[PDB]
Design a protein around this motif. Structure first.
Motif, mmCIF file in Angstrom:
data_model
loop_
_atom_site.group_PDB
_atom_site.id
_atom_site.type_symbol
_atom_site.label_atom_id
_atom_site.label_comp_id
_atom_site.label_asym_id
_atom_site.label_seq_id
_atom_site.Cartn_x
_atom_site.Cartn_y
_atom_site.Cartn_z
ATOM 1 N N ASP A 188 -16.572 14.027 9.581
ATOM 2 C CA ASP A 188 -17.744 13.299 10.060
ATOM 3 C C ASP A 188 -17.660 12.853 11.526
ATOM 4 O O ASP A 188 -18.615 12.254 12.021
ATOM 5 C CB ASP A 188 -18.049 12.098 9.149
ATOM 6 N N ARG A 241 0.837 -1.210 0.000
ATOM 7 C CA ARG A 241 0.000 0.000 0.000
ATOM 8 C C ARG A 241 0.868 1.256 0.000
ATOM 9 O O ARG A 241 1.705 1.449 0.885
ATOM 10 C CB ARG A 241 -0.985 0.033 1.177
ATOM 11 N N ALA A 290 -0.631 4.580 -1.830
ATOM 12 C CA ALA A 290 -1.548 5.723 -1.790
ATOM 13 C C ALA A 290 -2.448 5.796 -0.540
ATOM 14 O O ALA A 290 -2.596 6.884 0.025
ATOM 15 C CB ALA A 290 -2.389 5.783 -3.051
ATOM 16 N N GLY A 291 -3.065 4.684 -0.136
ATOM 17 C CA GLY A 291 -3.936 4.690 1.033
ATOM 18 C C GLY A 291 -3.683 3.496 1.931
ATOM 19 O O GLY A 291 -3.521 2.386 1.419
#
Ligand SMILES: *[C@@H]1O[C@H](CO)[C@@H](O[C@@H]2O[C@H](CO)[C@@H](O[C@@H]3O[C@H](CO[C@H]4O[C@H](CO)[C@@H](O)[C@H](O)[C@@H]4O)[C@@H](O)[C@H](O[C@H]4O[C@H](CO)[C@@H](O)[C@H](O)[C@@H]4O[C@H]4O[C@H](CO)[C@@H](O)[C@H](O)[C@@H]4O)[C@@H]3O)[C@H](O)[C@H]2NC(C)=O)[C@H](O)[C@H]1NC(C)=O
Ligand SMILES: *[C@@H]1O[C@H](CO)[C@@H](O[C@@H]2O[C@H](CO)[C@@H](O[C@@H]3O[C@H](CO[C@H]4O[C@H](CO)[C@@H](O)[C@H](O)[C@@H]4O)[C@@H](O)[C@H](O[C@H]4O[C@H](CO)[C@@H](O)[C@H](O)[C@@H]4O[C@H]4O[C@H](CO)[C@@H](O)[C@H](O)[C@@H]4O)[C@@H]3O)[C@H](O)[C@H]2NC(C)=O)[C@H](O)[C@H]1NC(C)=O
Ligand SMILES: *[C@@H]1O[C@H](CO)[C@@H](O[C@@H]2O[C@H](CO)[C@@H](O[C@@H]3O[C@H](CO[C@H]4O[C@H](CO)[C@@H](O)[C@H](O)[C@@H]4O)[C@@H](O)[C@H](O[C@H]4O[C@H](CO)[C@@H](O)[C@H](O)[C@@H]4O)[C@@H]3O)[C@H](O)[C@H]2NC(C)=O)[C@H](O)[C@H]1NC(C)=O
Ligand SMILES: *[C@@H]1O[C@H](CO)[C@@H](O[C@@H]2O[C@H](CO)[C@@H](O[C@@H]3O[C@H](CO[C@H]4O[C@H](CO)[C@@H](O)[C@H](O)[C@@H]4O)[C@@H](O)[C@H](O[C@H]4O[C@H](CO)[C@@H](O)[C@H](O)[C@@H]4O)[C@@H]3O)[C@H](O)[C@H]2NC(C)=O)[C@H](O)[C@H]1NC(C)=O
Ligand SMILES: *[C@@H]1O[C@H](CO)[C@@H](O[C@@H]2O[C@H](CO)[C@@H](O[C@@H]3O[C@H](CO)[C@@H](O)[C@H](O)[C@@H]3O)[C@H](O)[C@H]2NC(C)=O)[C@H](O)[C@H]1NC(C)=O
Ligand SMILES: *[C@@H]1O[C@H](CO)[C@@H](O[C@@H]2O[C@H](CO)[C@@H](O[C@@H]3O[C@H](CO)[C@@H](O)[C@H](O)[C@@H]3O)[C@H](O)[C@H]2NC(C)=O)[C@H](O)[C@H]1NC(C)=O
Ligand SMILES: N#Cc1ccc(N2C[C@H](N)C[C@H](C(F)(F)F)C2)c2cccnc12
Ligand SMILES: N#Cc1ccc(N2C[C@H](N)C[C@H](C(F)(F)F)C2)c2cccnc12
Ligand SMILES: *[C@@H]1O[C@H](CO)[C@@H](O)[C@H](O)[C@H]1NC(C)=O
Ligand SMILES: *[C@@H]1O[C@H](CO)[C@@H](O)[C@H](O)[C@H]1NC(C)=O
Ligand SMILES: *[C@@H]1O[C@H](CO)[C@@H](O)[C@H](O)[C@H]1NC(C)=O
Ligand SMILES: *[C@@H]1O[C@H](CO)[C@@H](O)[C@H](O)[C@H]1NC(C)=O
Ligand SMILES: *[C@@H]1O[C@H](CO)[C@@H](O)[C@H](O)[C@H]1NC(C)=O
Ligand SMILES: *[C@@H]1O[C@H](CO)[C@@H](O)[C@H](O)[C@H]1NC(C)=O
Ligand SMILES: *[C@@H]1O[C@H](CO)[C@@H](O)[C@H](O)[C@H]1NC(C)=O
Ligand SMILES: *[C@@H]1O[C@H](CO)[C@@H](O)[C@H](O)[C@H]1NC(C)=O
Ligand SMILES: *[C@@H]1O[C@H](CO)[C@@H](O)[C@H](O)[C@H]1NC(C)=O
Lengths: 737, 740
Positions: A560, A501, A503-504
């Motif tokens: 959120d 991994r 990018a994210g």
């Protein structure tokens, strides 16, 4: 009164003065008369005269090591007035000769790391009460030093001497006329090429003999060395250790030994520790006649005996290793071989007390792990720095032996320990732990392991209690990861990242809820910035969570507010480490959602600009709050309105410039050091740290000075470091006097 | 004839990273390309660029409000970059003149005709990264026939967008079609029928191999692969590049390549193709393939003894590079690589990250013209973010070009060669470039270890535990030109670590030597380094403070014997000051001297007289307080003087007006409050980071800046007033000198 510049403490029916590292240019004349031990090491003291300790007649111990931090000038008879001085430490003082007129009362004298080349009667023989004499590191690998001269019969008069250390001195010959009272003789790195029949004849009470570093194996040496002519070994006469019947420790490390004369041990039936590392003994390990002479040996070290240019397929262990009935530890690091077969270790399987096998740094490619079961009581199996694949300075130190625990005691305490760190286990093979005994402590650190943990990998050793998986590339996103280790209590996942991994990187910590006995979890430096399906960690057993080196700034900055109750599910947490999470501020609702069961909370080394002290009301058990290394500017004037349990408040390295009118019956330790306080405008406070603050030493500091005199129970450490910043007149001086 | 602010004029206007809250109205009329990226610009209106062929507004504001028809007035605009601007929709009323448009990293979910169809001149269109693994994004809607009217379009990038289907009605003018990570599980016969001019097609990350994925991913239902119809690539006769990385492929339909005889690059990394590598029927369909990448195709849980390579690999006649990283196997035998030995143009074999324990090195000789043998991250023992990047392929050179330029290169770094075995390099071809970095190698170099490959010209031995105290160390490599010994320390020496560098005098062709971070503080018999050929010496991370602080002055001529040296790096040596005699003994042949990142409190400028060839003096990151007023009396060669990060508070009278050779003067991040009238061929002057006092005293320097427009002063927005409080926070140029 408050002591200055020393920190006087009550020690075992005595009064001790800790006066080290204070930048003192001379012996303080403000030392308590009741003080019996003085530590003045690591200072700038340059002179010691007859009037240096005049008011301290009752002294028994003086430490003047590393003075001045260009040598130490001591007058003749400077210590003669101290009629009760028993221990004098004068290490690393650039002394050119042993001080004249030393008190006869001395029982312990250390002159290590000086430039003393002549050991004379005038300075040593009058000290008939000496028991321990350290003269090591005077004529070592350095210039001006040619040979250490030891006057004939200097130690002869010291009939009470039990320890003599002459290591790291150019001796060339064992000094004659040594007292028979000796118990420990240290002669390491003394350039002694030959040991004769008359060298230790009189030493019938000797229990330790260190002859290491004489004829060193130079490519392997920890010190710059010149080997004996023709790479020759130490020459030890057949009857050198003939009357050393009490010998327990013999250090022969780095002596270029190729043969070991079995006659050396005929009269030492009590030899307990034998150090043979850094020698040329591969052949002697294969057919050692000496192995039959050590029935009471408990520790044997045959490390770094590899043959230069060689990488043999197997290790050849003599069957005479079975005659080492008292063996507790075998150290065999740096033998360097490719395979360990079950039969090569057959001589060792009968040793009833063998609890440690040290096979680190051997580059073993294949081990038949079923062999470990055939051992009576193995406790430590150390296999770090081998090549197992997935199966489908301090001068008072031991320079040749690894003295520290091989495995962390916290791990080993649970049971049989297996250290497989720093090997090629890049994934956990289907047969990785096949035929292994009941392992309770397992280290798989730094293996470049990028396994996708599913709940089947550790099924062959299911009773692991402490698992170290640090410095790997593990994937534990499956909610069944490590659940086969139902008894797991400690889990170390520090310095872990997904191998692919880029990018994210989204973490899933649902596996943690499966454990009924998990107590300690370390997720430090995992760089956690997002949680998958379960956005909030849960555990009924978890006591301690280390979350340093993660991204709580990103998680708690969620639009959120998904991670608002991230640790609320850890219903039994008492210790939480949130250091190094780049936190500028913790949201009020995110702080209120930390477990109320917390007793120790560390938010140190972040970037906190704000801290709502009011929220401390929701934590009735909080005893330690660590907020060091942040950027806080304000302190609440109503701390007693928010807490009644807080005992320690750590606030050093912050931007606090004002102490509010109010500074809490529970508070015992208050750390306000390294802040921006210019001044300070019945408590149960026992420690107040204030060093490193820019104190303004005008008449304004007088009120606080009066407070310091009324409350002598409040210990203010490092008073020499509680310094005036202003005015220019007072700058540099301590706020006291 | 005037100095540009806030941009730097070249006619390009570099106006990026200037903290600008709006488009500057002080841009030259002659300027044809404007870079306004990485700024706080929030609005773009009809009157934004009223007073251009290219505009870059990327990463603004660090969403971007652009009005309809804001760019319509620019009748010659051909390239507009609007990346990472949080745009909710494609800007309305874009000029028809546009030939290149980029709209990456915004929040555009509807690709409409109203915003795209009227730009018939488009050649390159980038709409990637709009609906990727981020929220609010459901599926990118592409209006039927939006690209149909763009009959000049040659590049269409729709990667990292939830497409689910290849858009219909694509123009036949297309050459490059990027559809990576688009959620396209199926490719039909009609998807690319009209694209007869297509030369590149990227379909990677559609049904990804999720355990290996570089991005958070959901695999296709049941771990299934991308479904490509037998005739999907039927009329793609011009295809040169096909990217099928991370598409969970288990089988490769050989009929896909029947009509692409010109395929040059095929990326099949991150798939399940171990079986296809062993018996690939597709291998017979690629006679013009030059690059093949079958990396990270390992079977989870598996560590096979050998690599099974199909004999049909011999049918890849044009192959130049084979990438086979992450296959994960134990032993490479001479026979497993027999299919590859007949390929006449095969110059690179990439076998990195394979954990190979044993290799029969004699196999490499049986290759026609191999020049790169990459074996990093294997287990050989001693023998006794950017969205415009390639996410699945290692694009950087495998071996440093500086090394590879010498000849056949062998990279054996990050292996288990803890000592150099007697037979370590037996049966090896003529290796000219060798990397043995990070092997934990603690060999006692004697002059026999590299005798089997004696023509090594560049040797990388960094991050090891080597012992080179023997004066014969590496002397068997008589042709050695470059030697990298960075980050090296004795494996066993704890108390004292004395170096012996007599081995360096044996080399007749050695040019570059890097002894960085060796922690050298004492020398054995020879206190002086000597070489007739050495041209560059990197001595950073050593203890010249200890050596030059010698009571007996033993190291006073430590580098005087390096008669041919032109570059010397003495950074990071904890130097508080260099003794005058130690400085005078540096080689007079120097052209570049770096004493940066030390703790220098004093520099004797006069000594620069003994160095007539000195062109670059780097003194950055020290604690110097004084500058000589007679620099032209000590030098005439000096072109670049770097003094940033020092404690210089005064620029002496006649500092600049004397040194005609000085071209670049770095005085940034110092303690200058002003630049006097008395201190007033220079092409660059760095001054940002200084505590300028912006009273009428700064007016003389401001007049100087206006007279000498050739002297480029970079980062004028960072040349800021420290005092007084009214003028604080303002650039020294943004002041009204009319009060003075
Ligand atoms: C060749 O092989 C031999 C063995 O055959 C080996 O000999 C051993 O050498 C070491 C190092 O010189 C000895 O270790 C020291 O031992 C003393 C005494 O230990 C006993 O007595 C104490 C009580 O006085 C008991 O607690 C202890 O359990 C033992 O029974 C220790 O006092 C020494 O510790 C100090 O130094 C350590 C660091 O080196 C510190 O970790 C430790 O805290 C001690 O520090 C002292 O000073 C501090 C101030 O600086 C102070 O804060 C502390 O409180 C403390 O006072 C140390 O362990 C060992 O005993 C020798 N073995 C035998 C059997 O005698 C040779 O070294 C080896 N040769 C070479 C060259 O390698
Ligand atoms: C991942 O996270 C885990 C969990 O945090 C972490 O493991 C823990 O590490 C800490 C150290 O960082 C361990 O704590 C130390 O333990 C030792 C030994 O344990 C003793 O425990 C009991 C006593 O309760 C004994 O009966 C037993 O026999 C052991 O000897 C202690 O010695 C340590 O104490 C010293 O340091 C403390 C501060 O850390 C002080 O408060 C304390 O007073 C001690 O001071 C000593 O050192 C001073 C010099 O520094 C010296 O001047 C003093 O005189 C004195 O000698 C400490 O409590 C903890 O046990 C570990 N827990 C587990 C489960 O293993 C991992 O390390 C971490 N991993 C990574 C990679 O980061
Ligand atoms: C699937 O596989 C395909 C290949 O089949 C990959 O396609 C390549 O993608 C990369 C990245 O998007 C492309 O690289 C870019 O190419 C531009 C054009 O290069 C040519 O033209 C310039 C002159 O204009 C020449 O100098 C150059 O040598 C080429 O001939 C470059 O301009 C780009 O440069 C940018 O990055 C560099 C640093 O790398 C900077 O210095 C630049 O300033 C600039 O920012 C870049 O190199 C590449 O061209 C594509 N191949 C082809 C043949 O088109 C896919 O990326 C891959 N998919 C995935 C998801 O991995
Ligand atoms: C140990 O020490 C050695 C010697 O210093 C180091 O090796 C040198 O490393 C530097 C980089 O640190 C190399 O210099 C760089 O080379 C790049 C490529 O070389 C080009 O050379 C010419 C141009 O003259 C081209 O014709 C050719 O095709 C190559 O492309 C350049 O791109 C670099 O330039 C960039 O940086 C410099 C500043 O560093 C700027 O001035 C440029 O404008 C540009 O932005 C750069 O010149 C050097 O080539 C290496 N030498 C050798 C012999 O390999 C080792 O790295 C060091 N090891 C460790 C572990 O520290
Ligand atoms: C599992 O194996 C790893 C790797 O061997 C162990 O890591 C090692 O841990 C020790 C103690 O935590 C570290 O030692 C330190 O060394 C320095 C310098 O010599 C010394 O000053 C310190 O006081 C300390 O002793 C060692 O650096 C570290 N090595 C690496 C590579 O990280 C780990 O402790 C083992 N875990 C268990 C459960 O035993
Ligand atoms: C010999 O082998 C070593 C080990 O593989 C090579 O070191 C590697 O060198 C490259 C380039 O110098 C380093 O790459 C860097 O990567 C980062 C992150 O991806 C990137 O941001 C940098 O711009 C740069 O490309 C790489 O980290 C480094 N690896 C290690 C472990 O040091 C070395 O280059 C080889 N030498 C020769 C002569 O080829
Ligand atoms: N010539 C030569 C050798 C140099 C270094 C070696 N090893 C280096 C490792 N880094 C540590 C290993 C240790 F120290 F564990 F033995 C020794 C050799 C091992 C076996 C045989 N020859 C050599
Ligand atoms: N289950 C499972 C596996 C997990 C990780 C692996 N390797 C991790 C290495 N760190 C890099 C190696 C790569 F990426 F080079 F292939 C893969 C495996 C390799 C071969 C087979 N199984 C696994
Ligand atoms: C040491 O101190 C005495 C006075 O006590 C002085 O005469 C002498 O010069 C000093 N220096 C040395 C090196 O002894
Ligand atoms: C083994 O150890 C125990 C104590 O740990 C001891 O009583 C016993 O005598 C030892 N046995 C031998 C053979 O040394
Ligand atoms: C977790 O591991 C088990 C065992 O391999 C597997 O059945 C399960 O599907 C895995 N979970 C996921 C999310 O893949
Ligand atoms: C709960 O917390 C207490 C106190 O730290 C601890 O002793 C206990 O082991 C924890 N967990 C369980 C399940 O007992
Ligand atoms: C602290 O948090 C409480 C919420 O529990 C809030 O009412 C109060 O205003 C906060 N104080 C500050 C200074 O923000
Ligand atoms: C090999 O490469 C050269 C140019 O580098 C080229 O002319 C030749 O045709 C290529 N051979 C094959 C079979 O592709
Ligand atoms: C250097 O290496 C050669 C070859 O092993 C050896 O003969 C020589 O004696 C070594 N030099 C030293 C100083 O040991
Ligand atoms: C000195 O270096 C230059 C590099 O430009 C080279 O031409 C010359 O041959 C070198 N001198 C010697 C004696 O190697
Ligand atoms: C610089 O060095 C010369 C020696 O060449 C010396 O005469 C001069 O005084 C030095 N200048 C300073 C300021 O030390």
């Amino acid at each position: 009164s408050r002591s200055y510049p020393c920190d006087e403490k009550k020690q075992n029916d005595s009064v001790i003065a800790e006066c080290s590292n204070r930048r003192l240019q001379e012996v303080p004349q403000t030392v308590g008369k009741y003080v019996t031990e003085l530590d003045l090491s690591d200072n700038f003291i340059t002179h010691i005269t007859n009037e240096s300790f005049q008011g301290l007649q009752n002294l028994t111990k003086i430490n003047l090591n590393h003075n001045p931090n260009n040598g130490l000038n001591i007058t003749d008879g400077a210590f003669l007035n101290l009629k009760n001085l028993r221990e004098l430490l004068l290490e690393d003082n650039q002394l050119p000769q042993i001080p004249s007129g030393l008190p006869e009362s001395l029982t312990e004298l250390s002159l290590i790391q000086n430039n003393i080349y002549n050991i004379t009667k005038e300075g040593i023989s009058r000290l008939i009460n000496l028991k321990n004499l350290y003269l090591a590191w005077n004529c070592y690998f350095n210039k001006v030093c040619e040979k250490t001269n030891i006057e004939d019969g200097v130690f002869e008069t010291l009939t009470n001497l039990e320890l003599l250390s002459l290591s790291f001195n150019s001796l060339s010959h064992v000094p004659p006329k040594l007292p028979s009272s000796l118990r420990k003789l240290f002669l390491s790195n003394t350039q002694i090429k030959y040991i004769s029949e008359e060298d230790f004849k009189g030493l019938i009470n000797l229990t330790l003999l260190d002859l290491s570093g004489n004829c060193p194996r130079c490519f392997n040496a920890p010190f710059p060395c010149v080997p004996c002519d023709g790479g020759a070994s130490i020459n030890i006469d057949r009857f050198a250790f003939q009357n050393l019947t009490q010998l327990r420790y013999l250090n022969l490390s780095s002596t270029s030994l190729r043969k070991i004369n079995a006659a050396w041990f005929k009269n030492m039936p009590h030899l307990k520790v034998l150090d043979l590392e850094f020698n040329y003994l591969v052949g002697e390990i294969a057919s050692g006649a000496f192995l039959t002479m050590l029935p009471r040996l408990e520790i044997l070290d045959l490390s770094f005996n590899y043959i230069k240019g060689s990488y043999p397929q197997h290790i050849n262990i003599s069957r005479n290793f079975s005659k080492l009935l008292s063996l507790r530890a075998l150290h065999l690091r740096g033998y360097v071989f490719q395979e360990l077969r079950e039969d090569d270790f057959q001589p060792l399987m009968q040793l009833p007390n063998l609890s440690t096998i040290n096979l680190g740094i051997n580059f073993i490619k294949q081990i038949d792990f079923k062999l470990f079961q055939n051992f009576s009581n193995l406790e430590i199996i150390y296999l770090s720095e081998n090549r197992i694949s997935p199966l489908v300075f301090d001068p008072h130190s031991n320079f040749y032996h690894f003295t520290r625990p091989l495995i962390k005691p916290q791990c080993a305490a649970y049971g049989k320990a297996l250290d497989l760190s720093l090997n090629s286990i890049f994934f956990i093979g289907p047969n990785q732990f096949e035929n292994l005994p009941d392992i309770a402590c397992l280290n798989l650190s730094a293996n470049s392991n990028a396994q996708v943990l599913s709940g089947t990998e550790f099924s062959a050793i299911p009773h692991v209690k402490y698992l170290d998986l640090t410095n790997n590339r593990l994937d534990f996103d499956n909610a069944s990861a490590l659940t086969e280790l139902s008894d797991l209590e400690v889990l170390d996942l520090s310095y872990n990242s997904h191998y692919f991994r880029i990018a994210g990187v989204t973490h899933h910590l649902e596996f943690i809820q499966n454990f009924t006995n998990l107590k300690v979890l370390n997720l430090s430096h995992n760089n956690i910035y997002t949680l998958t399906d379960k956005y909030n960690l849960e555990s009924k057993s978890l006591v301690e969570l280390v979350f340093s080196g993660n991204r709580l700034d990103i998680l708690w900055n969620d639009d959120d507010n998904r991670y608002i109750s991230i640790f609320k599910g850890l219903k039994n947490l008492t210790r939480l480490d949130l250091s190094l999470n780049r936190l500028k501020h913790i949201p009020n609702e995110a702080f209120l959602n930390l477990p109320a069961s917390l007793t120790e909370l560390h938010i140190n080394d972040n970037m906190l600009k704000f801290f709502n002290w009011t929220l401390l009301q929701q934590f009735p058990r909080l005893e330690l709050l660590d907020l060091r290394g942040n950027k806080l500017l304000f302190l609440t004037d109503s701390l007693s309105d928010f807490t009644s349990s807080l005992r320690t408040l750590l606030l050093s390295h912050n931007r606090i410039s004002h102490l509010p009118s109010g500074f809490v019956s529970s508070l015992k330790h208050l750390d306000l050091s390294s802040n921006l306080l210019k001044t300070i405008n019945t408590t149960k406070l026992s420690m107040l740290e204030l060093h490193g603050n820019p104190f303004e030493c005008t008449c304004d500091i007088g009120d606080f000075r009066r407070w310091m005199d009324e409350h002598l129970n409040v210990k203010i450490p490092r008073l020499v470091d509680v310094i005036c910043a202003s005015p220019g007149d007072q700058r540099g001086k301590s706020i006291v006097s």
